[PDB]
Amino acid sequence: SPPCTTEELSPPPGGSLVEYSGGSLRVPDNPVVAFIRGDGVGPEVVESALKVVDAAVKKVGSRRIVWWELLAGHLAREKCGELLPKATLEGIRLARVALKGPLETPVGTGYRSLNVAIRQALDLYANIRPVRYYGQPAPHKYADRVDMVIFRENTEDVYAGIEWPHDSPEAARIRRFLAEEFGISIREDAGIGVKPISRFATRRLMERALEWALRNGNTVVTIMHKGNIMKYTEGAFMRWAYEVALEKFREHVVTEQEVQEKYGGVRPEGKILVNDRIADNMLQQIITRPWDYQVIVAPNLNGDYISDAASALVGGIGMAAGMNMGDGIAVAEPVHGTAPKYAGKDLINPSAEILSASLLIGEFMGWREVKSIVEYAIRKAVQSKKVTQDLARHMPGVQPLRTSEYTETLIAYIDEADL
Amino acid sequence: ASPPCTTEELSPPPGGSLVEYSGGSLRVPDNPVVAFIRGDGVGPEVVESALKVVDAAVKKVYGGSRRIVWWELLAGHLAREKCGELLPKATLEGIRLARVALKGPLETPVRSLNVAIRQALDLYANIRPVRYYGQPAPHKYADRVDMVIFRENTEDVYAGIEWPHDSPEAARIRRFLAEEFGISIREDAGIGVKPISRFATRRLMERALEWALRNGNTVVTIMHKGNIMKYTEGAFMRWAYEVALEKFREHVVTEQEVQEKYGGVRPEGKILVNDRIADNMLQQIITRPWDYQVIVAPNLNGDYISDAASALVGGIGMAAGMNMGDGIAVAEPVHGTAPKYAGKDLINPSAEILSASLLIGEFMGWREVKSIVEYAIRKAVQSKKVTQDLARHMPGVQPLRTSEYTETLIAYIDEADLNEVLAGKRG
Numbered sequence: 076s077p078p079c080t081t082e083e084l085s086p087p088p089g090g091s092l093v094e095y096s097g098g099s100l101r102v103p104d105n106p107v108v109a110f111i112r113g114d115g116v117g118p119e120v121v122e123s124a125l126k127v128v129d130a131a132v133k134k135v136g137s138r139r140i141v142w143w144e145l146l147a148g149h150l151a152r153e154k155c156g157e158l159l160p161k162a163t164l165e166g167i168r169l170a171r172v173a174l175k176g177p178l179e180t181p182v183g184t185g186y187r188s189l190n191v192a193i194r195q196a197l198d199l200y201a202n203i204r205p206v207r208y209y210g211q212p213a214p215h216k217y218a219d220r221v222d223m224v225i226f227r228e229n230t231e232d233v234y235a236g237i238e239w240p241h242d243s244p245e246a247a248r249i250r251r252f253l254a255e256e257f258g259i260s261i262r263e264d265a266g267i268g269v270k271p272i273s274r275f276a277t278r279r280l281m282e283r284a285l286e287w288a289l290r291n292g293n294t295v296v297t298i299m300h301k302g303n304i305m306k307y308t309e310g311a312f313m314r315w316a317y318e319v320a321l322e323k324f325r326e327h328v329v330t331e332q333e334v335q336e337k338y339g340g341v342r343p344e345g346k347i348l349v350n351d352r353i354a355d356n357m358l359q360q361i362i363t364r365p366w367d368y369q370v371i372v373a374p375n376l377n378g379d380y381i382s383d384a385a386s387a388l389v390g391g392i393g394m395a396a397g398m399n400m401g402d403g404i405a406v407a408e409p410v411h412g413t414a415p416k417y418a419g420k421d422l423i424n425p426s427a428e429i430l431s432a433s434l435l436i437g438e439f440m441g442w443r444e445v446k447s448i449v450e451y452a453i454r455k456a457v458q459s460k461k462v463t464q465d466l467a468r469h470m471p472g473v474q475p476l477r478t479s480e481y482t483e484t485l486i487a488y489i490d491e492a493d494l
Numbered sequence: 495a496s497p498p499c500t501t502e503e504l505s506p507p508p509g510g511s512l513v514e515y516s517g518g519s520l521r522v523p524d525n526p527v528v529a530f531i532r533g534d535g536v537g538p539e540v541v542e543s544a545l546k547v548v549d550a551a552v553k554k555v556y557g558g559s560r561r562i563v564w565w566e567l568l569a570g571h572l573a574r575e576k577c578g579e580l581l582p583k584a585t586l587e588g589i590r591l592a593r594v595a596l597k598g599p600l601e602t603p604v605r606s607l608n609v610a611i612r613q614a615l616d617l618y619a620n621i622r623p624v625r626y627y628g629q630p631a632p633h634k635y636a637d638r639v640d641m642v643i644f645r646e647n648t649e650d651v652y653a654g655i656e657w658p659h660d661s662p663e664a665a666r667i668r669r670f671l672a673e674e675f676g677i678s679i680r681e682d683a684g685i686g687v688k689p690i691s692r693f694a695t696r697r698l699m700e701r702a703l704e705w706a707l708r709n710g711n712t713v714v715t716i717m718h719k720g721n722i723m724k725y726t727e728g729a730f731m732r733w734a735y736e737v738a739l740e741k742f743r744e745h746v747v748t749e750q751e752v753q754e755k756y757g758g759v760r761p762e763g764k765i766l767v768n769d770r771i772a773d774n775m776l777q778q779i780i781t782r783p784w785d786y787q788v789i790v791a792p793n794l795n796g797d798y799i800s801d802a803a804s805a806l807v808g809g810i811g812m813a814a815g816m817n818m819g820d821g822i823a824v825a826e827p828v829h830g831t832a833p834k835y836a837g838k839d840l841i842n843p844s845a846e847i848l849s850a851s852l853l854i855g856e857f858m859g860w861r862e863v864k865s866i867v868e869y870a871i872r873k874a875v876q877s878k879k880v881t882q883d884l885a886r887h888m889p890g891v892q893p894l895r896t897s898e899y900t901e902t903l904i905a906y907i908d909e910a911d912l913n914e915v916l917a918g919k920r921g
């Protein structure tokens with residue numbers, strides 16, 4: 076029975092907890108990993124994920140995941156009478172690692188995003204969204220040239236939730252303050268939002284992007300910003316990112332505005348090109364010239380937009396994995412949300428949730444092999460035309476498979492593999 | 495002739511009649527005055543080409559019943575040369591009198607001339623059609639992209655309200671927010687303000703809906719991130735749906751009604767009015783472009799979506815555009831002055847031709863001119879009779895000069911079979 080309160084404290088029976096100390100992380104081969112089923116298609120895809128990884132971890136014995144169910148969204152509301160229990164947040168903070176499905180957020184009305192509350196409460200400041208081609212039917216002619224990682228700032232920007240309705244007294248006070256003190260005029264019938272971008276949040280992120288690039292061998296890191304129009308938030312974001320790159324990683328980093336002076340127009344091998352692109356231009360560039368970009372560093376909103384756009388190029392967000400990464404704590408979560416029209420239809424693509432599960436367990440926790448069996452199986456299922464409707468659409472002849480039958484295909488690919 | 499520098503020199507050309515705007519009605523005579531501004535860099539070359547192509551088109555389809563009377567106004571380097579200033583008030587007054595204008599790109603002074611024009615004339619709606627003309631394109635489904643983006647062009651984070659992180663202004667704002675609302679903002683943060691208003695949103699959506707009725711568009715999609723920004727983007731969405739039901743009820747049906755009141759089977763005749771969360775909208779134009787036509791968006795969202803759409807279609811150098819207000823429109827290409835091509839007879843004039851086609855064909859109601867110009871451009875591309883920007887993606891193809899491409903388009907227009915080219919596309 077899943078925990079409703081802080082009083083209901085209870086790591087699953089036969090499992091030690093993941094630990095974090097001195098910088099390093101310890102994964103006991105007996106780890107507790109928290110799971111939230113989520114909303115809409117969520118329960119469907121989370122149910123694939125554990126099943127699928129439970130077959131993967133079984134191949135290459137010493138280990139096994141003990142899944143620990145925590146409640147958020149409709150299931151928390153049906154059981155605890157609230158949407159995001161203190162305990163759910165505590166329980167992830169205790170397990171240190173979690174896998175979550177999508178949570179519903181109402182538009183214009185209702186409660187603030189529970190996905191954002193989790194990211195903000197748990198300080199998961201880096202949203203890491205790899206964009207990869209696995210052979211799936213795709214709308215982009217050169218989808219196989221997209222191989223990217225988005226480092227999306229996960230705490231501030233308009234996501235801070237600072238805004239007031241147009242007809243609130245609070246909006247009217249801000250209108251009055253801005254008119255009297257700075258001579259700024261805002262219409263009486265305007266809603267008002269505030270956009271903060273800080274030095275601390277952007278540096279933090281850029282540093283993680285930098286080290287991610289050095290660990291994987293990435294050679295280009297691109298800052299996506301609309302700094303020509305928003306000089307003091309987006310432009311500042313760009314300046315602060317360049318600054319840390321040159322301060323802490325000088326030897327590993329080069330500028331474009333330098334390559335064209337000291338390196339005769341060509342990026343020297345062993346040195347990461349650090350460049351930047353105006354946000355609308357960046358959207359065009361991933362479409363027109365995808366092979367020229369690798370690590371993309373963005374404030375919260377730009378990062379949200381670019382990651383959805385890039386995943387669509389390679390087949391849609393049905394394949395799009397994610398990781399909300401903080402210092403010694405991560406929560407795996409697909410790019411895609413709730414997809415309510417597909418909710419209880421056995422149609423949805425579980426790949427994104429499975430690959431988030433693999434990104435957590437593989438890259439973060441350290442079980443690299445679960446990543447590759449993880450990748451091999453999807454690759455095989457894909458490069459054979461056994462796919463859910465979202466991929467099957469972008470190809471003639473290809474009959475589509477249900478969620479359950481796609482997952483039972485993956486399972487068989489895992490159990491029957493030459494390691 | 496000689497273009498005007500002063501109000502008193504303002505005289506629309508002989509043979510022409512002024513487009514009128516009285517009530518909410520645009521009255522376009524058979525011999526309409528249309529202002530044009532040559533502009534800077536490649537501007538004169540592409541404007542010149544657009545006048546010639548458009549004139550051949552109107553003569554062909556209307557057989558001398560109709561004829562545009564072009565009226566030259568100055569802005570940019572020609573205004574400097576002739577008048578001593580970059581943007582004479584007379585040019586603004588000229589556009590206001592004419593109601594319709596084609597302009598070339600303008601150079602940014604070392605305040606921006608384009609922004610000064612939209613503000614003086616209150617051109618609040620930025621309109622960007624995105625269509626496929628047969629170009630080499632990175633989208634497998636490029637030929638399924640046929641869209642128009644209605645982008646609100648006055649508010650949002652583009653209003654310019656923001657302060658540096660170390661300003662005393664920013665510190666005052668941090669203090670004010672902390673004391674009055676208990677909001678904490680970091681000491682090292684830049685601060686921007688995002689306003690979205692009922693009035694600007696309604697005007698925009700109204701123009702979008704009117705376009706949808708005019709052109710037979712059957713879907714209008716509101717792009718917003720209203721789940722996160724409840725009171726700006728969420729309000730935009732709510733206000734846009736609201737005027738659709740208030741001022742277009744009988745013509746319109748809502749996606750919420752379709753799933754609830756109907757079978758999922760959108761009632762025949764009606765324009766579907768729906769909405770997509772902005773990140774999904776970016777995915778949707780790439781995965782399911784055929785489901786979208788008119789897209790209505792706040793300033794930033796509109797900027798991002800129209801550029802992404804143009805990239806799908808290989809139309810970046812070819813993108814047409816228009817800024818529209820109440821009785822008034824100025825068409826111009828998306829592209830800039832392309833200074834290294836200037837005067838070289840190498841530039842692609844298609845974007846400017848298509849801005850003219852947008853102005854005349856779509857805003858002035860002269861449909862047949864749109865149909866035949868688009869017919870000619872598609873035929874040129876199919877024939878590989880194109881300028882270097884397109885020819886570079888066509889192995890072995892000898893590129894045409896601007897002037898040669900212009901004359902090729904004219905010959906396709908002149909020799910066209912209107913029985914075929916205007917089937918369903920007249921009146």
Ligand SMILES: NC(=O)c1ccc[n+]([C@@H]2O[C@H](COP(=O)([O-])OP(=O)(O)OC[C@H]3O[C@@H](n4cnc5c(N)ncnc54)[C@H](OP(=O)(O)O)[C@@H]3O)[C@@H](O)[C@H]2O)c1
Nearest residue numbers: 177178179180190393411412413414423424465721771774
């Ligand atoms: N943080 C999160 O986990 C998360 C993420 C995004 C959204 N959300 C929330 O979810 C709700 C839905 O918003 P939305 O409809 O804009 O976004 P969405 O749930 O991501 O749905 C967008 C579209 O993507 C496709 N799609 C998504 N997941 C798929 C999968 N697993 N397999 C195959 N196709 C898939 C479907 O496309 P087609 O229609 O073209 O078939 C779907 O209509 C909102 O309340 C939003 O706030 C939560």
Ligand SMILES: NC(=O)c1ccc[n+]([C@@H]2O[C@H](COP(=O)([O-])OP(=O)(O)OC[C@H]3O[C@@H](n4cnc5c(N)ncnc54)[C@H](OP(=O)(O)O)[C@@H]3O)[C@@H](O)[C@H]2O)c1
Nearest residue numbers: 599600601602608811827828829830831832833841842883
């Ligand atoms: N419409 C407007 O009034 C407006 C809009 C934007 C910019 N501008 C102004 O224009 C100036 C231009 O700046 P820029 O240096 O960035 O040059 P640009 O005008 O943006 O052109 C850059 C590149 O785009 C390609 N290109 C653009 N339009 C093309 C077309 N019509 N046909 C074929 N190729 C085309 C060219 O070829 P390659 O890519 O092969 O080199 C060119 O080098 C700026 O000062 C800016 O203020 C004005």
Ligand SMILES: [Ca+2]
Nearest residue numbers: 379383410773
């Ligand atoms: Ca998103």
Ligand SMILES: [Ca+2]
Nearest residue numbers: 355797798801
């Ligand atoms: Ca733009």
